[PDB]
Design a binder for this molecule. Structure first.
Ligand SMILES: Nc1ncnc2c1ncn2[C@@H]1O[C@H](COP(=O)(O)OP(=O)(O)OP(=O)(O)O)[C@@H](O)[C@H]1O
Ligand SMILES: Nc1ncnc2c1ncn2[C@@H]1O[C@H](COP(=O)(O)OP(=O)(O)O)[C@@H](O)[C@H]1O
Ligand SMILES: Nc1ccc(S(N)(=O)=O)cc1
Ligand SMILES: [Mg+2]
Length: 1723
């Protein structure tokens, strides 16, 4: 890299700040005349005549202006002279503009027209405007001007339904008032703070137009912030490639074109410059400089000059005087009034208009305080911001209405309000500047503004500007006000802070990045056009025209500064930057680097509040504050009144600052001017600086100093010491009241126990007694509850339940309340864990559960402490000791099985050549894991456990066991179970083409349906299944032989046993252990797993011996892993995500710049977005297509088969993505391209980490939480899901290593740092899912009594772990006795619950038996509570409406997710469905399924994920409906039962109860029905009996339409029924009555049931039913499948005597309207 040079930075800089002039000479216009007065020199320049109207230079009227821009212009008939040249520029082009004009010329309306244009392209046809589509930024230099603008602009655009809102000050992470607004108005340094925050593209993404008002501020010491701002923005336009319009508004000053360059303005098309001949009113300006320095006489001289100047106006004229003190307005107004009453008493009577009128108006307003009463009767008045109230806005009135004759006012009036005067006289021009620590000349920006108020636009002809100042070196002002003071760049002054900001953002990563950034600065353009002025020689410039040396030297110098102060780690060699937490905080809280060093140096855990106050005063933003003599006395008084001792700071500036702050909190009235100005300064800085110290110390875990610092933050905010009364924080509560309660030695906590009457009776003030009670209960108060379960001997899982215990009030609490959860050691010295909890208003009084892990150490202490502290409220916290007194730590886990460094095992150890073949073509030798394992699995016929990290090759370890089975047995059968369906389908693909193609042995994959699955188990050598599918088969293992005689049983990913749905896995694996040892032909168990801590427990459970148990440590992983965990201390997920964007790219380029990359993101929407970001970042880096490793031409043939539109675009750029909205085809395509090498990067959603057969070199996990709409919260990725993600970063054949970067919220970092490197512990949750499996065992009669239930548990993993980690399973005791006790108390509850729910019967306490409800739940695999609710909610008159409600309330649909902002989506659907729901809470999955079910019936296409959810719903719908039939028929109800069967078919075909049966046929629309309704065809029976020529002539056909419908009626069941009553003649009461039903189809043709709008491929089902229609009674029932010919018998019992009238029913569960009816009689 290039050599660098350390720079004398202080030399290169412009020391004079805004006052600096590289102006040299100064030419005056034609009026030159100088009128000396010995004591002071006078200089005049005359008003300018107005330039001539050019050829076709007319003034455009609003009439001609576009009809949509008319609004916001009532109050205007025509356009200004300036505004005419710019109408095309502003409203007809999107070109960047730079406008220069006299202040007052009307540049603002030009900015307004530009706004209108951006609004112009959001007109939305009928709907008036697209308010939520865009945003405009208006950057103004003064807070007073901003509020002025929000006012004016707010009126204009109110007719557009558009909102413009203020946003400047101390707004840290602003509220949703910025998300609602469309025009943001603010100051530079505000906007800078916002766009530094890392999460910024949420405020700025929508921003289409930003406006820089008074951009000459560039010249000021605030100048850099503008440069920083614009450089930052411009660079972003390049990155996102989203065009943003820049508009500059400046005053007529030199260098304007350099500024236009800076703004990327086209000199030909966007530069508009208007010299001072374009003023609103022509200006007669007068400048006077006091020659002599007699300072007392100075005021006397100065006040004499104002005197005579005012006199030359009197009766008809109006004067404005500007001075520079809140109190100087009063002095001056009275000083002149007395002056002109003792110096020849020149008439104030000469002032009051007429001879004595309007004097009564000025007297009728005289009843107002603040020395205004004294001036108003006369001709004088005053205006200042400082504490002036409504009077301020009334002096404004009378001046504007021309009653007030002489107004002297502070500068803020020039910005705050548009009231101009005929003549303006600026007095003195000196200002006390706190940060400079002295008196200096005021800003060039301020002078211009106020002196631009000379002459009222509609009532004046000439304006008179008088400028009184020092003669000494202030011809500078002539330069300013006559187009001659040049605009320079002040960047060097603020370089290292400005650099640091970008570094923290990720915008610059190295000196090179930096040096490029500098090129965006106005600094760069000036150094070019004026190199000598900036210390560059003419010779350097010609040799280095792009200033590559200087910009690197500049950067290098500032880099060393940030390094010295530890804001940034920088090495001179590579030139790379690393960001530190110190520099991160620095940038975020806007504090200079030198301060951060001081804090880093002085802070320490044991800091006292005394030393704390000391430290704050060493802040470098105070480095200029001195202690003046004229204020030493008053400081001494303050020091004696303030509470915190100030050591030996004595009369140093440190002491001054320290007590100034204390005085502020004590609310001490101050007296000394300047001393007040100083106080204001350190107080506004005090929030940030403290909050910064808080974060520094929070992060280091310093418990005590964290508490001190947060409290100090709150004292400054709430202006009260910590000892005072919490009630003071209520600002609407009489301050004498609070003083009364304070002086009582009374503890605040005791106020909660008193009522309004007792309160007053103790304050001795019975009036306020009731309103205090109101406030006490408004005060934030939380209850904390804790639950503990130890994980290892080093970490415990803590479940904190916070519960709000107060009344909410949006005018007191706002929309939320922030807290900090702090968990600390016994000594309360260390913060062990911490996180930020946010109580949103909507969910106040709602339960909040917070989970997290904490470290524990060898000899445990009694307790830890959880403290929950308000972020804003003083004396507002809640503490909770977490006792360890009864804590039993789990047993020490055994070491990992050692990795023997055996020499690698070649494929030749496998003998069989048909075997070796499917391996030899792949890899040369076996990894150290497979070699070590081999011997035991391929040679032995016994049980074995393998525990290695994912990516280690355990799959083929399992395959070893399978080869042996095929070797040892001809048609042997092995069962293989993976916990995930997407994994099941992955192995089946691998194994089918491995075992049925290569080895010619049938390989099968189980499905939902029982009958067809039974068949597959039969013909299969290799069986593949998820645990749930295998459970419903093996549940009846007695009745099924094929389950019993299986040779081999492989369990993969057995660590998932500790996850959700872990129970079912554990139950089946135990069922195999039970069976195997119960038939004496031992089944071989082979279990594969991630590295376990407690593998001994698993092996002993599954029959493995220690030796044949292979649990390796994660470091054993064949491809070594490089893990990096990157925390983000950002709580708001959307923000966290957005600020992870740049770090994702930067990670690719660092860790895997060439090799492939997978990025996981939490959602489908994120998947598309992150991809697009990577592209745009890439193209901005000038790379464009560095992730495409083929040519675009090569891809076209594949991308032709894509319809997504956008991954077509992204893949073309080398980046793909994956979610579940993509077609299975679209997925396969993308994966293929990735494995091939064509694309380097795919972004996949978290859900697809299980369904991906793709490996990268680098895996990036972007955030680790997903939103769960049910509990309105974000929840963590299961560790299982993350272990998997990381496994994707291994490619054994191509990389020397795998790399993983996890990006997570900071509160999560420490958790990942343990459970990724170390082995994993696992527990059972069988006990929390114990009912359904017991209920099934009692049905199968494996559990015949209570003892058998205890015996059954002895085969489970649960049984092993209860002894090893008792507190996890809440075994309050320890071992041996408590164990038998707890087992028996567990079986007791479950049987009780099952008995109470009608599922089982308990007889003699010991014995159990299945009941009806229990039989139906075991059969259909339905949770027992579902059928409890089914039998509880189904009556005699339930119809298909109530049936849907009941079925959707199934416990099965509980797990249906509610995603972010679907509550708005579901709310819409509800007001669009046939059957309305009452009180339907839209975070309830049941409410969701209910609507999603109607939408499916109503053939509605909707959101992608909703159709995707509908699929998971329908997938369980059938078994649920069938269950309902069973219950209604078990209860003898006729009506509901039949309607329930209708539901079964109408679900399958997706149609309603009275929808035309014509909808069963493909391609038919709702209009095709009425062209058959009128025609005479309203049935499917009709279209089958009419000839073919007449059939296709009916409606519109195609060749492929005829093909689909033909095959439809080749499977539409043809029905005919014959029946006889056996012994029809001889039948009596109480005797059996047999009805023999004959069934046969004539189709002969059969096949898969066609129901296009149904995700499952289901089979035909039929119910034959007998009932009494008259009395609503179901008499007999039988379900079957046709098989072409069938004989169904079903008998019942006869009534007392006579003959009855019955009905015979024949219903389908699949097709609509095949149903037959028959009336018959017996006896
Ligand atoms: N001896 C070997 N040499 C090189 N590559 C191998 C070897 N054995 C397996 N592989 C490959 O390594 C990849 C990872 O192996 P595998 O899928 O078995 O991981 P695992 O450790 O079993 O965990 P999981 O199966 O849960 O991902 C597979 O794609 C496989 O093809
Ligand atoms: N077409 C117009 N008709 C009447 N008044 C105008 C017109 N254009 C601008 N003005 C007035 O000129 C005054 C000063 O102009 P402003 O828009 O504040 O820009 P600037 O002061 O930055 O030049 C404003 O009070 C505004 O009302
Ligand atoms: N300021 C801050 C925000 C969030 C977090 S954390 N640890 O909850 O993510 C810490 C500090
Ligand atoms: Mg595996």
């Amino acid at each position: 890299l290039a050599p660098r040079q350390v720079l004398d930075l202080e030399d290169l800089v412009f020391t004079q700040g805004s006052h600096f002039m590289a102006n040299k000479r100064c030419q005056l216009p034609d009026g030159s005349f100088r009128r000396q007065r010995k004591g002071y020199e006078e200089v005049h320049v005359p008003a300018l005549k107005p330039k001539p109207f050019g050829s076709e230079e007319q003034l455009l009227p609003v009439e001609k202006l576009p009809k949509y821009a008319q609004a916001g212009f009532e109050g205007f008939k025509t356009l200004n002279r300036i505004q005419s040249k710019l109408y095309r520029a502003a409203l007809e082009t999107d070109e960047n503009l730079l406008l220069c004009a006299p202040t007052g010329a009307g540049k603002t309306n030009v900015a307004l027209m530009c706004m209108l244009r951006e609004i112009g392209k959001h007109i939305n046809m009928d709907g008036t405007i697209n308010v939520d589509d865009f945003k405009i930024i208006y950057i103004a230099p003064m807070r007073s001007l901003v509020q002025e603008m929000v006012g004016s602009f707010g009126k204009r655009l109110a007719t557009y339904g558009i909102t413009v809102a203020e946003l400047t000050g101390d707004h840290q992470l602003c509220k949703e008032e910025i998300s609602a607004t469309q025009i943001i108005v603010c100051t530079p340094e505000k906007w800078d703070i916002i766009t530094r925050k890392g999460g910024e593209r949420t405020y700025t993404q929508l921003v289409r137009l930003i406006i820089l008002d008074e951009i000459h501020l560039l010249h000021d010491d605030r100048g850099p912030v503008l440069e920083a701002l614009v450089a930052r923005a411009i660079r972003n336009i390049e990155m996102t490639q989203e065009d943003v319009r820049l508009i500059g508004l400046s005053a007529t000053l030199p260098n304007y074109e350099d500024v236009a360059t800076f703004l990327r303005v086209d000199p030909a098309k966007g530069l508009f410059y208007f010299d001072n001949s374009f003023r609103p009113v022509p200006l007669e300006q007068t400048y006077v400089g006091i020659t002599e320095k007699k300072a007392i006489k100075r005021f006397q001289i100065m006040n004499e000059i104002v005197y005579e100047k005012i006199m030359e106006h009197a009766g008809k004229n109006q004067v404005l005087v500007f001075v520079h003190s809140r109190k100087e307005t009063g002095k001056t107004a009275r000083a002149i009034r007395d002056m002109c009453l003792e110096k020849d008493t020149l008439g104030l009577f000469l002032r009051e208009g007429s001879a004595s009128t309007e004097v009564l108006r000025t007297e009728a307003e005289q009843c107002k305080n603040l020395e205004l009463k004294d001036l108003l009767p006369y001709g004088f008045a005053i205006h200042h911001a400082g504490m002036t109230r409504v009077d301020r806005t009334l002096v404004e009135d009378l001046f504007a209405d021309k009653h007030i004759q002489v107004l002297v006012s502070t500068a803020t009036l020039a910005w705050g309000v548009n009231l101009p005067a005929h003549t303006v006289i600026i007095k003195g021009t000196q200002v006390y500047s706190p940060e400079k620590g002295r008196w200096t000349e005021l800003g060039a920006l301020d002078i211009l503004q106020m002196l631009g108020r000379a002459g009222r636009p509609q009532y004046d002809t000439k304006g008179e500007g008088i400028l009184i100042t020092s003669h000494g070196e202030l011809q500078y002002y002539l330069s300013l006000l006559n187009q001659q003071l040049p605009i320079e760049s002040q960047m060097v002054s603020k370089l290292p802070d400005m650099l640091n900001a970008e570094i923290v953002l990720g915008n610059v990563q190295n000196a090179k990045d930096a040096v490029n950034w500098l090129g965006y600065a106005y600094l760069y353009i000036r150094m070019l056009r004026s190199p000598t002025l900036y210390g560059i020689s003419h010779d350097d410039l010609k040799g280095d025209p792009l200033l590559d040396q200087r910009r690197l030297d500049l950067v290098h110098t500032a880099a060393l500064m940030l390094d010295k102060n530890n804001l940034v780690k920088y090495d001179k060699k590579t030139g790379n930057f690393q960001v530190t937490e110190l520099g991160r905080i620095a940038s975020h809280y806007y504090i200079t680097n030198d301060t951060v060093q001081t804090y880093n140096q002085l802070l320490k855990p044991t800091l006292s509040e005394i030393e704390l106050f000391r430290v704050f005063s060493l802040s470098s933003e105070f480095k200029n504050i001195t202690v003046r003599e004229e204020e030493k006395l008053e400081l001494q008084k303050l020091l004696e009144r303030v509470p915190i001792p100030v050591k030996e700071s004595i009369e140093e500036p440190s002491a001054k600052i320290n007590v100034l702050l204390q005085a502020f909190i004590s609310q001490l009235k101050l007296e000394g001017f300047a001393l007040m100005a100083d106080m204001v300064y350190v107080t506004q800085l005090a929030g940030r600086l403290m909050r910064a110290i808080f974060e520094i110390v929070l992060n280091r875990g310093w418990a005590q100093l964290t508490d001190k610092t947060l409290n100090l933050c709150k004292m400054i905010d709430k202006r009260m010491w910590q000892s005072m009364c919490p009630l003071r924080q209520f600002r609407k509560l009489p301050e004498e009241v609070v003083k009364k309660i304070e002086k009582k030695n009374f503890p605040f906590e005791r106020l909660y126990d008193l009522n309004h009457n007792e309160i007053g009776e103790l304050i001795r003030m019975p009036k306020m007694g009731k309103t205090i009670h109101k406030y006490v209960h408004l005060f934030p108060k939380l209850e904390l509850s804790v639950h503990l379960q130890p994980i290892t001997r080093s970490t415990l899982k803590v479940e904190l339940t916070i519960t709000p215990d107060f009344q909410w009030d949006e005018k007191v609490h706002g929309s939320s309340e922030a807290f900090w959860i702090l968990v600390e050691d016994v000594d309360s010295e260390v913060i062990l864990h911490h996180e930020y909890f946010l109580l949103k208003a909507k969910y106040a009084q709602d339960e909040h559960l917070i989970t997290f892990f904490v470290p524990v150490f060898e000899p445990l202490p009694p307790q830890y402490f959880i403290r929950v502290v308000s972020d804003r409220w003083l004396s507002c916290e809640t503490q909770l000791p977490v006792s360890f007194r009864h804590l039993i730590l789990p047993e020490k886990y055994p070491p990992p099985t050692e990795l023997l460094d055996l020499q690698p095992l070649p494929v030749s150890a496998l003998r069989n050549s048909a075997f070796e073949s499917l391996y030899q073509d792949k890899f040369p030798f076996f990894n150290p894991i497979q070699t070590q394992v081999f011997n035991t699995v391929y040679n032995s016929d016994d049980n074995v456990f393998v525990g290695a990290p994912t990516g280690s090759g355990k799959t083929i370890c399992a395959e070893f066991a399978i080869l042996r089975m095929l070797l040892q047995s001809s048609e042997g059968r092995c069962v293989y179970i993976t916990p995930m369906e997407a994994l099941a389908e992955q192995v089946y693909m691998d194994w089918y083409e491995k075992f049925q193609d290569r080895l010619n042995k049938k390989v099968v994959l189980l499905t939902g349906e029982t009958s067809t699955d039974l068949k597959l188990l039969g013909k299969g050598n290799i069986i593949i299944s998820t645990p749930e599918k295998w459970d419903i088969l093996s549940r009846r293992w007695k009745q099924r032989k094929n389950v019993q005689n299986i040779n081999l049983f492989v369990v993969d990913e057995v660590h998932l046993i500790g996850g959700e749905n872990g129970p079912v896995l554990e139950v089946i694996c135990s069922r195999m252990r039970y069976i195997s040892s119960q038939i004496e032909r031992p089944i071989r168990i082979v279990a594969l797993s991630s590295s376990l801590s407690n593998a001994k427990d698993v092996a002993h459970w599954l029959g493995c011996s220690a030796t044949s148990t292979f649990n390796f440590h994660p470091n054993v992983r064949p491809v070594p892993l490089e893990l990096h965990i990157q925390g983000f201390n950002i709580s708001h997920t959307q923000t966290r995500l957005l600020s992870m964007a740049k770090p994702v790219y930067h990670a690719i380029t660092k860790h895997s710049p060439k090799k492939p990359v997978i990025v996981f993101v939490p959602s489908r929407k994120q998947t598309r977005l992150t991809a697009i970001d990577i592209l745009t970042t890439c193209a901005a880096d000038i790379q464009r297509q560095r992730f495409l490793h083929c040519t675009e031409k090569d891809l076209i043939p594949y991308l032709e088969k894509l319809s997504d539109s956008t991954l077509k675009e992204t893949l073309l750029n080398g980046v793909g993505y994956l979610h579940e909205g993509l077609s299975p085809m679209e997925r396969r395509l993308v994966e293929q391209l990735f494995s091939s090498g064509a694309i380097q990067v795919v972004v996949a959603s978290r859900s697809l980490c299980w369904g991906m057969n793709v490996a990268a070199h680098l895996v990036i996990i972007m955030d680790t939480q997903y939103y769960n709409g049910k509990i309105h919260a974000y929840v963590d990725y299961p560790i299982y899901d993350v272990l998997q993600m990381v496994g994707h970063a291994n490619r054994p054949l191509q990389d020397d290593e795998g790399r993983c970067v996890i990006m997570c919220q900071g509160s999560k970092k420490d958790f990942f740092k343990k459970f990724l490197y170390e082995p994993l512990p696992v527990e059972s949750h069988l006990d929390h899912c114990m009912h359904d499996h017991f209920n099934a065992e009692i049905v199968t009669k494996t559990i015949e009594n209570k003892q058998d239930a205890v015996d059954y548990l002895t085969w489970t993993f649960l049984y092993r772990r209860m002894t090893q980690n008792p507190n996890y399973y809440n075994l309050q005791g320890i071992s041996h006795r408590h164990l038998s006790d707890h087992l028996s108390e567990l079986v007791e509850q479950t049987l009780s619950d099952l008995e109470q729910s009608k599922c089982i019967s308990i007889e003699d306490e010991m014995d159990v038996a299945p009941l009806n409800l229990g039989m139906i739940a075991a059969y259909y695999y339905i949770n027992y509570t579902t059928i409890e609710l089914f039998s509880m909610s189904l009556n005699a008159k339930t119809k298909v409406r109530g049936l849907i409600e009941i079925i959707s309330n199934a416990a099965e649909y509980e797990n249906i997710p509610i995603r972010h902002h679907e509550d708005n989506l579901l709310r819409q659907l509800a007001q669009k469905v046939p059957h309305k729901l009452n009180n339907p809470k839209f975070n309830d999955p049941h409410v969701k399924t209910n609507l999603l079910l109607q939408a499916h019936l109503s053939r509605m296409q909707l959101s992608a994920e909703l159709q995707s959810d509908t699929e998971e719903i329908l997938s369980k719908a059938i078994r649920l409906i069938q269950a309902c039939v069973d219950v209604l028929s078990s209860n003898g109800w006729l009506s509901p039962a039949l309607a329930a069967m209708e539901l079964a078919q109408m679900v399958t075909q997706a149609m309603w109860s009275k929808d035309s049966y014509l909808k069963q046929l493909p391609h038919f629309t709702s209009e095709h029905i009425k062209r058959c309704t009128d025609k005479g065809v309203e049935s499917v029976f009709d279209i089958m009996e009419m000839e073919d020529e007449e059939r296709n002539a009916l409606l519109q056909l195609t060749d492929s339409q005829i093909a689909d419908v033909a095959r439809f009626c080749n499977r539409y069941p043809n029905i005919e029924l014959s029946y006889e009553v056996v012994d029809k003649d001889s039948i009596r009461s109480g005797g059996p009555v047999v009805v023999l039903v004959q069934l046969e189809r004539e189709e002969e043709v059969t096949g898969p049931v066609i129901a296009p709008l149904f995700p499952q491929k289901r089979e035909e089902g039929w119910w034959v039913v007998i009932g009494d229609a008259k009395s609503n009674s179901l008499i007999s029932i039988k379900r079957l499948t046709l098989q072409q010919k069938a004989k169904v018998k079903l008998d019942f019992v006869a009534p007392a005597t006579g003959a009855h009238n019955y009905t015979l029913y024949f219903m389908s569960d699949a097709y609509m309207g095949c149903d037959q009816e028959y009336k018959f009689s017996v006896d």
